[PDB]
Design an enzyme around this catalytic site. Structure first.
Site, PDB file in Angstrom:
ATOM      1  N   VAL A   1      74.241 -27.612  46.613  1.00  6.43           N
ATOM      2  CA  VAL A   1      74.188 -28.787  45.734  1.00  6.43           C
ATOM      3  C   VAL A   1      74.967 -28.588  44.425  1.00  6.43           C
ATOM      4  O   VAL A   1      75.150 -29.523  43.644  1.00  6.43           O
ATOM      5  CB  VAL A   1      72.734 -29.188  45.426  1.00  6.43           C
ATOM      6  CG1 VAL A   1      72.344 -28.765  44.018  1.00  6.43           C
ATOM      7  CG2 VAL A   1      72.556 -30.685  45.594  1.00  6.43           C
ATOM      8  N   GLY A   2      75.426 -27.364  44.199  1.00  7.03           N
ATOM      9  CA  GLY A   2      76.117 -27.010  42.970  1.00  7.03           C
ATOM     10  C   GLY A   2      75.267 -26.148  42.071  1.00  7.03           C
ATOM     11  O   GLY A   2      75.603 -25.963  40.907  1.00  7.03           O
ATOM     12  N   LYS A   3      74.163 -25.624  42.601  1.00  7.12           N
ATOM     13  CA  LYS A   3      73.275 -24.777  41.812  1.00  7.12           C
ATOM     14  C   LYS A   3      74.050 -23.621  41.233  1.00  7.12           C
ATOM     15  O   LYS A   3      74.321 -23.585  40.036  1.00  7.12           O
ATOM     16  CB  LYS A   3      72.177 -24.178  42.665  1.00  7.12           C
ATOM     17  CG  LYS A   3      71.196 -25.132  43.292  1.00  7.12           C
ATOM     18  CD  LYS A   3      70.034 -24.285  43.765  1.00  7.12           C
ATOM     19  CE  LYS A   3      69.440 -24.788  45.056  1.00  7.12           C
ATOM     20  NZ  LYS A   3      68.580 -25.938  44.719  1.00  7.12           N
TER      21      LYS A   3
ATOM     22  N   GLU B   1      61.388 -44.604  51.270  1.00  8.84           N
ATOM     23  CA  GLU B   1      61.509 -44.618  49.830  1.00  8.84           C
ATOM     24  C   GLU B   1      61.147 -45.972  49.249  1.00  8.84           C
ATOM     25  O   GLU B   1      60.602 -46.058  48.155  1.00  8.84           O
ATOM     26  CB  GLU B   1      62.915 -44.230  49.413  1.00  8.84           C
ATOM     27  CG  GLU B   1      62.940 -43.439  48.113  1.00  8.84           C
ATOM     28  CD  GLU B   1      62.096 -42.178  48.186  1.00  8.84           C
ATOM     29  OE1 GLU B   1      60.898 -42.277  48.509  1.00  8.84           O
ATOM     30  OE2 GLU B   1      62.631 -41.085  47.919  1.00  8.84           O
TER      31      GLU B   1
ATOM     32  N   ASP C   1      54.152 -35.860  52.452  1.00 10.31           N
ATOM     33  CA  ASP C   1      53.319 -36.946  51.970  1.00 10.31           C
ATOM     34  C   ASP C   1      51.860 -36.696  52.371  1.00 10.31           C
ATOM     35  O   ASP C   1      51.003 -36.469  51.516  1.00 10.31           O
ATOM     36  CB  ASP C   1      53.803 -38.277  52.544  1.00 10.31           C
ATOM     37  CG  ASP C   1      55.330 -38.406  52.558  1.00 10.31           C
ATOM     38  OD1 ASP C   1      56.047 -37.397  52.382  1.00 10.31           O
ATOM     39  OD2 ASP C   1      55.823 -39.539  52.754  1.00 10.31           O
TER      40      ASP C   1
ATOM     41  N   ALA D   1      80.867 -31.836  38.516  1.00  8.75           N
ATOM     42  CA  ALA D   1      80.820 -33.289  38.527  1.00  8.75           C
ATOM     43  C   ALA D   1      79.390 -33.795  38.457  1.00  8.75           C
ATOM     44  O   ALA D   1      78.515 -33.279  39.144  1.00  8.75           O
ATOM     45  CB  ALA D   1      81.510 -33.826  39.765  1.00  8.75           C
TER      46      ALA D   1
END
Ligand SMILES: Nc1ncnc2c1ncn2[C@@H]1O[C@H](COP(=O)(O)OP(=O)(O)O)[C@@H](O)[C@H]1O
Ligand SMILES: Nc1ncnc2c1ncn2[C@@H]1O[C@H](COP(=O)(O)OP(=O)(O)O)[C@@H](O)[C@H]1O
Ligand SMILES: Nc1ncnc2c1ncn2[C@@H]1O[C@H](COP(=O)(O)OP(=O)(O)O)[C@@H](O)[C@H]1O
Lengths: 458, 446, 458
Positions: free
Chosen positions: A58-60, A277, A351, A17
């Protein structure tokens, strides 16, 4: 040892997906690998080694497999770790044994979960942690340069995190690329949820669209285990059918489950993240000498460290001014957080580490004219086995640098903070619309900036 | 052949959530088909974190007690020292044996003899391995494994589709071993006043098996001496006695060492407990052993991203441990290292890494490296800022430490109480803690 | 490669004089190894690797062999050295080749003279002296964990000195023990002397009891070569029969022989040693907050460094107070020596190194509150391949530490000294009775303290 997937897996791109780019950017591998032959002799070619970067689950692997199972040769996977854990010299022997086995399939896929087990090197973790990696690694690099076109094959690596890799791995001829995937897109988790949601009945009142919209969160594996979870909840009560709330709470159960302890992105951790963000976004955004670009979101997670890295490593020459402005941007996150919140802040590092580096840089390496002139207090090379940074000055100078750098940072910081608070109202706005809806395209971003709403009909 | 397996937790003491987080499995074990059609599924293999004789095998089958289904046994050692390819050939026939038995349990034992990191054993490994991978959804199976040290077990085995999971089973307790001695009270009589009720006490840190074995031979110390029946004393002696050899092989601690350790943990607990803008958690115990290990791991995985003061409150808790000691005690102190080691490692963090604002600030003086094998921080900064970092860290700490000492100082009863009860009653849990806290005793509950 | 002893040696426990504990503590290996079988399956077990520590020629090998020839399998011995002297990688190959050969004898003994050749590791002796030993060593460690019960076998290591070993070797499953042996006990050297004294005639006037009493000295190998020496003295004069003085002087000859130069424990070096051992003893002994234990002697020689080490490495928590008092005890030795003697003192170190370490510790690692807080200026870990100490502070703090430590020591020292001289008369007494008679049990130790004599009839 390794893992062979005999002659086809199942699964394919209609089993994954979202994540278009990833998909189509990998196209040329997929179908190229369909035909290696007429291909190479046509003057075209391939990365022939590939990495993606994304969270755990994550779907890797998932994607990799979808490729391997469609374009399709056996899917040969191994985990990096299985390696370094081994002794001097046996490691190497393997990287190869693995390959040869995978190599007789032309074309084929090498997919390696967690290549972190290798890429890196030093002179600091002295005595126990250096030699091997670079060692067995080269074995892999040598393997990598050890081809030519005949053999169509793809080495596919997964890790949550590009950097820990020695840049030696990005060179052309093997993995010369990066594709990162933020899976948890709303529509993403819709589609995902569902594909898994089937093996099971659903109370009608169940409609994914809403669960999905209210999950985030959230990740593919996360979700599946959520669902599977609810299913079994019912399964153990001798039960049958799962109304919305069973799935729901399953969402919570999972949400407090991860690691060994309670850890949750609650009705704030999101908020915080979003104010951040927004901090960056808003910062990078100004006019009259704005220096930076635009692409906002929540939950990318590999990338925040992109400014320098992706472009630094190829080449092009930066303007000082810029660099500062951008440093300012880096600190934007913290700045925001300090501004709006309890004047308690959050262990959100990278950061700083960036801005810091950009500055340690500015002073020593690139001539930029503090009290240190256009003189090179920093060498760094990229030699084919080499390609890292180490450097000659004197305790004193090294110290003048600590001071200067802290000043650079602080001052810059204080700037960005002043600017943010100047634009504060806007700050909240962006922050907010963000945290609830979780994505913006640079334009509509700015749009929410002017104080004029928009949404798409969908 | 195989039929109705034995025991059940009806004979197992303590280890609750352990099990009823098992009840899920036990169930599928009775009613397997119920998932596949239903699109559900299960851990498919599991392992136990605990010493020898904690009741591991004991529970590993006790499941099969309710799950009631062939409960197959394979030890890890046997696999090693057979021979080449046979080292594999066994484990193989092993499952398809365990198999069309769906449902049923397959227990393996002393994995380390297998689950390690040049031929033999790991052929057992790759063998076991492939099967579970050589596998299907439909099929109904739960494997069992027990070991005392998740550590050296090669982490490959710990994957998904494999054991993505397990339970630690905390061996003894004050009640736990009592109530165990109990389940074992029926066989044989006895005349004294004591129920073992305290006997459980007179036994410091102690394990289920180490109890049972004890008993039986107390009943023997009986039978011989021409016995009917047992005396408090008999067992008691059977205890201190069978003990003196583990006393070589295991550890006793003095009516003091205990004391302190109770006071420490008391101070920790309290420190993470307070009111009006302040942050913490809770669960408490003394486990002469599992303690020492339980720490290393949370460090390796020590992760989330928490808020600036929190960290100061943490620091506050560790140092709290010591402080407690110093206050309540004879004004001497004790190698209680790790607390410091980590209040230190936090503060040092806060200075050099997560921008937090001493006179250092939003700069990154130290960077971490990551993932696993190792994970931890490379230092870049010049001797001065190093000196400073030290000075600052010393303050940060000393500041906190004298703060917590203040907290503990005052709420001091509560310190007392928690310590005392804890000390004598080897553990506390969640709630009652708050109770012990507020002018409130407990009587014999459930 | 190695040395196999074919199928039984000779010699046994009736061929070894004294050292009960060693003997009977090893029992369970001896007869266990008689029966490995019914043994392991009975729920019992074994160290299955063993070390003893004692001087050169104390009877180490001798004991080991006695075991091997009695409980009895072939005695497979090798010397550690035979190893490290070799190249990268070949070492490992051996440790094993050795083992397998020794392994096919179930049960069996691996005895290794001088395992010092391996146990240790670093990051300091950089470049030439680190890698291999840890390397080939692990080969041995891996060998060690590489068993289970089937194979009854015992790895037996001899070395004058526990420490130089990496603590990694003490771990259960392999050498998880220590047995040290002070052989030169009076009765000890009686029995020893004699067993060797046979092959030769004796003038009647020879009675061992007295030679023995007046040797010390002295050690098993030392003695034998003394005796053998006298025998040959006569042997070379075409002679026959050795009166007492031939043996005697042989004792001297030997006594000036050792190493390359004159070196003798004369009618003082003993004395000194005795005043020391009394210094310690006397020190550890006080009342009202005494902190320490009691067990006196002369010539143990591996152990004086026991306080921390033996107990440190397992676990239990120390009182500051104690630690000082004990440090004081460590320095007791020197203190005494300064008190009584020519105000010249003697290169007798380990004590200092101890006290020093206990203090460097007190400051950095354990929270103990000098001007350094409860903050951790010392990390040390024991990781399965790891398990040693290295640490992060700043030149400055490092220095504040040098100072503080020297102060701790000095001050503490000055204390013990004052105490000793306060008890001086007693100091002498203990010192003395000791020097001549060379052993005391803690009680009668004290007795000599009250100033009331005793002896046993014998
Ligand atoms: N986009 C997705 N669609 C369907 N399933 C997913 C997706 N992402 C993760 N999963 C689930 O997680 C598994 C793969 O995890 P993966 O993302 O490869 O972990 P990692 O991020 O460590 O590579 C898949 O088998 C699948 O069931
Ligand atoms: N909770 C308990 N209840 C009853 N008996 C127990 C319990 N825990 C341990 N035991 C006793 O200890 C014995 C060994 O337990 P187990 O942990 O299986 O040993 P191992 O650790 O060697 O596998 C069991 O046979 C059982 O009688
Ligand atoms: N207790 C003893 N009884 C008899 N002989 C001994 C004794 N101790 C040492 N020896 C002599 O020394 C030899 C053993 O030397 P050993 O003590 O093993 O040296 P090391 O201390 O280096 O191991 C024996 O063969 C024997 O001649």
């Amino acid at each position: 040892r390794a893992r062979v997937l005999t002659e086809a897996p199942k699964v394919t791109f209609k089993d994954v997906a979202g994540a278009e780019e990833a998909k189509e950017e990998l196209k040329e591998i997929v179908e190229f690998l369909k035909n290696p032959s007429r291909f190479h002799e046509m003057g075209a070619r391939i990365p022939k080694g590939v990495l993606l970067v994304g969270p755990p689950g994550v779907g890797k692997t998932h994607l990799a497999r979808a490729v391997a199972g469609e374009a399709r040769v056996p899917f040969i996977t191994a985990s990096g770790s299985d390696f370094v854990e081994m002794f001097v010299g046996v490691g190497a022997a393997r990287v190869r044994d693995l390959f040869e086995t995978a190599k007789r399939h032309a074309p084929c896929i090498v997919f390696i979960d967690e290549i972190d087990a290798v890429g890196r090197k030093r002179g600091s973790g002295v005595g126990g942690g250096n030699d091997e990696r670079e060692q067995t690694l080269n074995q892999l690099l040598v393997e990598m340069d050890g081809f030519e076109k005949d053999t169509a094959i793809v080495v596919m690596a997964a890790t949550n995190r590009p950097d820990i890799l020695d840049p030696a791995l990005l060179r052309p001829g093997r993995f010369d690329r990066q594709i990162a995937i933020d899976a948890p897109d709303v529509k993403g988790r819709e589609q995902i949820l569902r594909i898994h949601a089937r093996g099971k009945p659903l109370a009608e009142d169940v409609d994914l669209a809403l669960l999905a919209k209210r999950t985030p969160g959230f990740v593919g594996a996360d979700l599946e285990n959520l669902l599977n979870e609810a299913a079994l909840l019912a399964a153990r009560e001798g039960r049958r059918k799962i109304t919305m709330k069973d799935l729901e709470e399953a969402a919570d159960r999972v949400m407090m489950l991860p690691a060994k302890k309670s850890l949750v992105l609650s009705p704030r951790d999101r908020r915080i993240t979003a104010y951040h963000e927004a901090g960056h976004a808003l910062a990078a955004h100004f006019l009259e000498h704005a220096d930076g670009v635009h692409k906002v979101t929540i939950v990318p997670r590999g990338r925040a460290l992109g400014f320098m890295m992706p472009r630094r490593e190829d080449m092009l020459h930066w303007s000082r001014k810029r660099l500062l402005d951008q440093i300012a941007v880096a600190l934007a996150g913290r700045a925001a957080e300090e501004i709006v919140f309890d004047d308690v802040t959050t262990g959100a590092e990278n950061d700083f580490r960036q801005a810091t580096e950009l500055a340690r840089r500015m002073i020593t390496e690139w001539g930029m004219h503090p009290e240190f002139g256009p003189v090179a207090y920093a060498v760094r090379e990229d030699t084919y086995l080499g390609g890292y940074d180490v450097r000659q000055y004197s305790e004193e100078t090294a110290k003048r640098i600590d001071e200067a750098v802290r000043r650079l940072i602080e001052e810059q910081y204080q700037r960005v903070k002043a600017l943010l608070l100047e634009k504060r109202e806007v700050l909240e706005r962006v922050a907010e619309t963000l945290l609830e809806r979780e994505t913006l395209t640079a334009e509509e971003f700015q749009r929410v900036v002017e104080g004029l709403p928009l949404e798409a009909p969908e």
